[PDB]
């Protein structure tokens, strides 16, 4: 079947792989974007399936690094990858 991709494959995409870590669970979330995309929109559909507010989430890596919603797609992979994590903020600022 030709257009029949049950994952979303433009061409040039980044995969970014977020789970739970604050959490017990951990819910794995594969987003499929271009770098064009920010991580602000990446974040949101990230937290969407963690059912949490992404305006007051952070996203750590698995290493231990705070990533903020502010970089663009290319740049997030570029630096780390597929490895993050969604973790809600406590205080202004995580």
């Keep these: 079947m030709s257009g029949g991709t ?3 494959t433009a061409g040039s995409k980044v995969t970014f ?5 604050s959490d017990p669970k951990l819910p794995f979330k594969v987003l499929s ?3 064009s995309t920010p991580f602000t929109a990446v974040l949101k ?4 399936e963690f059912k949490v507010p992404a305006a007051t989430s952070a996203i750590i890596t698995n290493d231990g ?3 903020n919603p502010a970089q663009p797609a290319g740049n997030i992979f570029l630096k780390h990858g597929s490895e993050l994590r969604l973790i809600p903020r406590d205080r202004v600022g995580h």
């Excluded at 792989?17 to 870590?21: G, P, V």
């Excluded at 559909?45 to 969407?48: G, L, P, V, Y």
């Design 45 to 48: 559909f990230a937290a969407e």
């Design 65 to 67: 690094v705070g990533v």
């Design 33 to 35: 974007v271009p770098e």
């Design 17 to 21: 792989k977020i789970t739970l870590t």
């Design 6 to 8: 049950a994952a979303t």
